[PDB]
Amino acid sequence: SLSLVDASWELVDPTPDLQALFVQFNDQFFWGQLEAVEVKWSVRMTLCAGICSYEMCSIRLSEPLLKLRPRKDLVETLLHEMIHAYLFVTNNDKDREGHGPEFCKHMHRINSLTGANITVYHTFHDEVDEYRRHWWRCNGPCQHRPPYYGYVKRATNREPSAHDYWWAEHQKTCGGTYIKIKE
């Protein structure tokens, strides 16, 4: 009934309709509460498959990473990001960890309803991600700025600094602090 899993789940969708999926999912899984959330494709984002940004809440999905993947990857990424958005909109985003019990409650619930496999972790380009595993996010306004949306992801444990050639502009236009979120 709310089941998402059929033969096509495993297959690429030539013509995904992101706005339609968002409207469907808001209705079917989030009690209509994500009406004011903006979801868009990003054509240059490659650092992440999906992100959120918070003022109003915005979701972006990577066209380069998702357009030719099976439709389960678009859907599971979108639902993952919508759970973050829901915790934001409902002022329930106070868990210490990125994906704490509150995230995981919705993940389990929607997986149960749909047969899907939303996860706390990413399920594609395993080797790229495995090595490029040190992640920071700026807690400043560049979070809304494409194509990085505040993220830095490195294969070594070296935090952003003045010896990055992109630093001066960042400090001048944004000025936020990079917070380490993954190792």
Ligand SMILES: [Zn+2]
């Ligand atoms: Zn997440």
Ligand SMILES: [Zn+2]
């Ligand atoms: Zn910044």
